[PDB]
Write a protein that binds this DNA or RNA. Structure first.
Ligand SMILES: [Mg+2]
Ligand SMILES: [Mg+2]
Ligand SMILES: [Mg+2]
Ligand SMILES: [Mg+2]
Ligand SMILES: [Mg+2]
Ligand SMILES: [Mg+2]
Ligand SMILES: [Mg+2]
Ligand SMILES: [Mg+2]
Ligand SMILES: [Mg+2]
Ligand SMILES: [Mg+2]
Ligand SMILES: [Mg+2]
Lengths: 110, 48, 201, 103, 117
RNA sequence: CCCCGGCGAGGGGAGUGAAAAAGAACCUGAAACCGUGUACGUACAAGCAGUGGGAGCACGCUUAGGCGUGUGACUGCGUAC
């Protein structure tokens, strides 16, 4: 029984979050939560809140138990980018992209 | 004799040239104007 | 030649040159095409680079900027620019020689009698301007899609046919090439065919 | 036992019961075609190499089916010379089944 | 009568990109590069339908040469012997016999040696 | 309405609806571009990256059919528009 949680429009680039996502791909949720606790990354805090929210969905909506859950699927897709203007020297302007990402965690006992 | 059965005479409605519509048409990329010079230009050509 | 009436069962003599000539498809096609062109309204226009609202200011200088050279924001290459060959209100009506027009009607009329699509009656009228009567009358004659041509345009017959979709009445002088072809049957009174012969010499 | 015959400007090494694809023969489907032009017949260490064709050697076959081969695309292209043309092609063939190899 | 080009343009761009399946990088993704790759592929295919007939004949000749020298004669004298013996087996078949039927190939060498001697 | 969360954002249920993969960043939702999964290839190998030949593997078959599909070791030729 798969269970999904998502964080859409997370204020972080997908390239930075993917560094944390591949740390927990395939691990048991108990072991994954410890990995995210001691990963000195801002994305580790974002992924942890999505992971534990997927755990809550699995136990409250699907009645699953925490002891058997595993991170079967996790991926980070690119979200919409916010365009910003940054002035540079000699009157030139640059367009700054504040990238976002969609974080998706899928836990399952099977 | 219906509106969707009348046909023009054979050879009375020749199709016009369409310049610059690809290689297969035979008139692409120059419209039969050669390469350069006054006569190849838009509005080019000498008076009578 | 004789045109047998449908009800009186009497023949009606007509000119062989008008109702018995060959079918000139090339001639009829040109007249039919020209008639459709005459119906075109041709009311349309776009804006050239001269009519597009905007300024004649050069968007950026000729050299140095590193961009493709531009001379006007109205250029047809640009978004919101003008149309290169913007249309104007034009007239699509063609010229048809008088003899080519009349020559096409004869070829159409002679083709109708060859297809038995021309029905000749001595008279055709209804008492009151009520479409129910006319619809009943055509059902008696086994007619649904028919062009009715009369000598004198009666108002009752005109009003009774106004709401019938596949039916229309017409004066003897009001016939046109595409109407004679568009309808499955053509019903002409004995007076109308007489007036048509004088029209077509 | 196998034999070598020539058909359609090419030669084939076939054996009994084998299906071989040849060029288009003007023979209806299901008919029997004879190849009296046999170049060689080998039968268990007993080989018959023939001057022109093996004397008496005949191969009987059954026209299985006609058809057209896979479509090949012909692309001609001259760079910088404003010239290119394309053309498809499907070659007609005739499948025959070797019914008998007569020495 | 304005004509929007969107539907037919996408159709012919897909037709090119479909023929470019399996090409590396942009050659299977972007139309400008895929179109050149497809044209070049057609040129090579036309050229190689002629080269295929040369490469296979070159392969048959090499195999015949090997099998002939196993019987004590070179490819040159072997081919000349067969023509003097009026044998008209082509090189595709000779190379086929040389691999799958040694004894029949030896019989051909004997026939060729006889026409020379 | 319930659950996770910061009395957040966001999400999972429930419910509405013909449809919620119509949820307001809302008809359809192409392409570039970016990912996850699977099959195959790839760490002694030199170049317009394909093409001709071609093993092996995977898979669909049919079924002893010996075909199809994906991949492509190795090899001939090959300097984009
Ligand atoms: Mg010139
Ligand atoms: Mg030029
Ligand atoms: Mg010059
Ligand atoms: Mg303006
Ligand atoms: Mg405009
Ligand atoms: Mg006039
Ligand atoms: Mg040659
Ligand atoms: Mg909420
Ligand atoms: Mg949508
Ligand atoms: Mg290696
Ligand atoms: Mg090379």
């Amino acid at each position: 029984m798969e269970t999904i949680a998502k964080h859409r429009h997370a204020r972080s680039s997908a390239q930075k979050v993917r560094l944390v996502a591949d740390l927990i791909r395939g691990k048991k949720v108990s072991q994954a939560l410890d990995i995210l606790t001691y990963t000195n990354k801002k994305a580790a805090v974002l992924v942890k809140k999505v992971l534990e929210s997927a755990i809550a969905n699995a136990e409250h909506n699907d009645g699953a138990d925490i002891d058997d859950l595993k991170v079967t699927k996790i991926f980070v897709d690119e979200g919409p980018s916010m365009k910003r203007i940054m002035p540079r020297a000699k009157g030139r302007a640059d367009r700054i992209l504040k990238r976002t990402s969609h974080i998706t965690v899928v836990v399952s006992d099977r | 004799m219906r509106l969707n059965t009348l046909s023009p005479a054979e050879g009375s409605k020749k199709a016009g040239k369409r310049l610059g519509r690809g290689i297969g048409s035979g008139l692409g990329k120059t419209g039969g104007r050669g390469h350069k010079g006054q006569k190849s230009r838009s509005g080019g050509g000498v008076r009578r | 030649m004789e045109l047998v009436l449908k009800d009186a069962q009497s023949a009606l003599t007509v000119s062989e040159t008008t109702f018995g000539r060959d079918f000139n498809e090339a001639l009829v096609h040109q007249v039919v095409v020209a008639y459709a062109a005459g119906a075109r309204q041709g009311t349309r226009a776009q804006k050239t680079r001269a009519e597009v609202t905007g300024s004649g200011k050069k968007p950026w200088r000729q050299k140095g900027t590193g961009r493709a050279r531009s001379g006007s924001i109205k250029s047809p290459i640009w978004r919101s620019g003008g149309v290169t060959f913007a249309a104007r209100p034009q007239d699509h009506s063609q010229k048809v020689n008088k003899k080519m027009y009349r020559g096409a009607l004869k070829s159409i009329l002679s083709e109708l009698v060859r297809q038995d699509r021309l029905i000749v009656v001595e008279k055709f009228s209804v008492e009151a301007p009520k479409t129910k009567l006319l619809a009943q009358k055509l059902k008696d004659m086994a007619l649904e899609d028919v062009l009715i041509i009369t000598g004198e345009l009666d108002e009752n017959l005109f009003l009774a046919a106004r709401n019938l979709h596949k039916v229309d009445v017409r004066d003897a002088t009001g016939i046109d090439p595409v109407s004679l072809i568009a309808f499955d049957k053509v019903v002409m009174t004995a007076d109308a065919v007489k007036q048509v012969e004088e029209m077509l010499a | 036992m196998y034999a070598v015959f020539q058909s359609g400007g090419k030669q084939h090494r076939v054996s009994e019961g084998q299906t071989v694809r040849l060029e288009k023969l003007d023979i209806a489907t299901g008919e029997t075609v004879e190849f009296a032009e046999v170049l060689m017949i080998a039968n268990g260490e007993e080989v018959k190499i023939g001057v022109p064709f093996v004397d008496g050697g005949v191969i009987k076959a059954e026209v299985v089916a006609h058809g057209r081969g896979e479509k090949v695309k012909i692309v001609k292209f001259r760079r910088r010379k404003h010239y290119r043309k394309q053309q498809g092609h499907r070659q007609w063939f005739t499948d025959v089944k070797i019914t008998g190899i007569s020495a | 009568a304005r004509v929007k080009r969107g539907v037919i343009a996408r159709a012919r761009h897909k037709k090119i990109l479909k023929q470019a399946k399996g090409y590396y990088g942009a050659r299977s993704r972007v139309y400008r590069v895929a179109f050149q790759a497809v044209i070049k592929a057609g040129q090579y295919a036309y050229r190689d339908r002629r080269q295929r007939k040369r490469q296979f004949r070159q392969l048959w000749i090499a195999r015949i040469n090997a099998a002939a020298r196993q019987n004590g004669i070179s490819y040159s004298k072997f081919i000349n012997g067969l023509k003097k013996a009026s044998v008209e087996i082509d090189r595709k078949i000779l190379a086929d016999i040389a691999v799958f039927d040694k004894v029949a190939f030896t019989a051909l060498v004997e026939k060729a040696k006889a026409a020379l001697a």
